[PDB]
Structures are given as structure tokens and as C-alpha cells.
Amino acid sequence: MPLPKSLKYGDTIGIYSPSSPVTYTSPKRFERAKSYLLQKGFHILEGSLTGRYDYYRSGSIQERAKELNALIRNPNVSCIMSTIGGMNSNSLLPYIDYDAFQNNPKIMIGYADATALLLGIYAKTGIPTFYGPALVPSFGEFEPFVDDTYKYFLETLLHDQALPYNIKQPLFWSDEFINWEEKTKEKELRPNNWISVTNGQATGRVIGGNLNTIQGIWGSPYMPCIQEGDILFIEDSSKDAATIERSFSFLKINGVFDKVSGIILGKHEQFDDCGTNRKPYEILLEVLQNQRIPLLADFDCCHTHPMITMPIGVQVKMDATNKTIHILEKWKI
């Protein structure tokens, strides 16, 4: 497994907008996010589409691919981070310079729609990528949560890590819908718990990301093939019960649950239960139909705050019963 170099203070983080033009539509949170990382001691290299607006997206398919490729090809950039998600990252996949990435591996990080690029790069190059902070939603967050997200960010990308790296459960979380551009209030601290939905243990390569986004790359050369023993990691956000039942069944009929040895389900930001008062793992439970797969839910790697940074494509040990996650193989130098 070829690995990216650890982040170091003084390094340059290159940012790009593969989908929504957030640097145009949310300039205050964008500037706040840049300033936050600059103060920590990282430089920011703004991609070529920063500040541009093409309505639902930052620019054309070709322009977006060029923005990302310029960062991949830049030897001065140690980390490539999406500004935010959207719907349209998968449009870039045919045009990405995977050979340039494989020849000099970098840290590739982000979440939600950026899953298309995280998984595509992993599928094409075999280099682990990272489900974690996007610049504007994650680092543009006000105190206190941004500081917890940052701690996880350093733990995975910067710290010399004694293995196994036990991913520690944050004490509090929030999916509260406020304080986007300007801080009007204080976010309620939700006491936190991971859920032991189905007891057991699994070890294998972790694969996954945003499930809604995965259905946009499924079956293509850019979706890594799920293998027997893999641990499936999935999260969704701001969907309703109908939508996630379809996504869960999509996995079911593709025979994914006949393959994976365990499941980690993220919290679901602003979930719409359609009046059923059922939680997402419950809907997943119906789809599974009493197939015993260890299942740990409400994992904090998703649209809720704070956010863990998770390596994708490396061996992991999940213990749903004892509610632990350990990274058992090196994801960086």
C-alpha cells in the first residue's frame, strides 16, 4: 500500500470546489474557516474556482476537473481538501489525473458528495483517502465544536500514531441547524453515545462514505469492489425514512450484506422520520431481516459536529458490543 506523507505545520492545504459554490454563497464562514487553519499554522492555496458561481455548482465539468488536477500536480501541496459537497463530484471522475496522484501521493480529505472522489481515487490508485473535514462546514464551525473536529484532524493526519489508533467517542455532539454565517446562539450539547445495535466483532478493510453519493458511482471503475470480510461504513444526512430505506435495500439486493463482516452507521443529521418515530438503524434492521451482522450506529463521522477523520481502505477492528473502532494498519508515513 502506497501512503501519503503526514501533514506537518507549515504545509499547504489546497482547496477546491467539486460541487456547490460555497466560497461564493457563504463568504463569512469561508473566511472564518481559512483564518482558523492559518492560525493553527497551515497555508491555504485557493483553487482556481474559488469565488466563482455557476448557480448549483462552481463551474463546468472541465473547469472543476482542471481545478482539482492543478492541486494534484502541485508538488507544494501536501493535502487536498474539498470546500464543501453538493451533488456533482462524480462528474469529475473521468478527467482526474490519477497517475499524477499515484506518483506523488497526497492526503485527500473531505466528506458527503466528495465521497465520489475519495473512493474514486482509492479505487484507481490504491492509496488510502480520508473521510473527514471539508473546509467550510467543518472548520468554519464556531466554538466549541470546531476545536474537537480539529483535534481529530490532527490525530489522524499529523500525530505520529501508536497503533492501534483507538477512535475515541466525543463527549458531546450537535446536528443543530443554526450559526452558519453568523452566530446567533449557542448549540445545545447532546450527550453522546454509540449504539450497540447488533453485538459482535469484525475485522477487515473499511470501505464506504456517504451512501447517497455511493449510488452515484456504483458499478463504475471508480467504486472499489466490496470484498468478503470488508467492514462497511455508511452515513447519510438530511434525508427521510423513505430515502434511506431505498439506499439500505440497494445494498441488500447487491449482496453487500452477504459479504461484509460488520457495519458502522453514522449519525443522521436532521433525519426526517416521516412520523414513524423509527431511527435509521431500525430501518436498516428491517432490511437485514435478522441476519446477524455486528452493527455499531451513531458513529461520529458524518454531517454532525464534531467530526472524526477516518482513513478509508485500511484494516479496522469494530466491536459493536464494546463499541470501539481501531485502525490496525498504517494509513500514512
Binding site for ligand AMP (CB under 6 A): 20, 84-86, 112-113, 137, 177, 180, 237-238, 269, 303
The binder of 296, among ligand AMP, a copy of itself, none, by C-beta within 5 to 8 A per type, is none
Look at strands 310-312 and 12-16 and give their pairing.
unpaired
Q: Which of the stretches 142-150, 176-184, 271-279, 322-330 binds a copy of itself when contact is defined by CB under 8 A?
A: 271-279
Least separation in angstroms between residue 252's CB and a copy of itself is 7
The binder of 137, among ligand AMP, a copy of itself, none, by C-beta within 5 to 8 A per type, is ligand AMP
Least separation in angstroms between residue 181's CB and ligand AMP is 7
Side-chain half-sphere exposure of 68, counting CA atoms within 13 A: 31
Please give the grid coordinates belonging to residue 248. 439500505
**Beta-bridge partner residues of 310:** 131
> Residue 98's CB: how many other CB atoms inside 10 A?
17
Among 103, 242, 291, 328, binds a copy of itself (CB under 8 A): 242
Least separation in angstroms between residue 155's CB and a copy of itself is 33
Q: Which of the stretches 25-33, 69-77, 199-207, 239-247 binds a copy of itself when contact is defined by CB under 8 A?
A: 239-247
- Of 115 and 198, CB closest to ligand AMP: 115
Q: Are 261 and 202 in contact (CB under 8 A)?
A: yes
The binder of 177, among a copy of itself, ligand AMP, none, by C-beta within 5 to 8 A per type, is ligand AMP
E-state strands within the chain: 12-16, 43-46, 77-82, 107-110, 129-131, 165-166, 172-173, 190-191, 195-198, 201-210, 231-235, 262-266, 295-299, 310-312, 315-319, 324-327
Binding mask 212-231 for a copy of itself (x = CB under 8 A): ---xxxxxxxx---------
Q: In whole angstroms, what is the distance from residue 12 CA to residue 47 CA?
A: 12
Distances 92 to 64, 193, 229, 236 between C-alpha atoms, Å: 7, 37, 30, 22
54 binds a copy of itself (CB under 8 A): yes
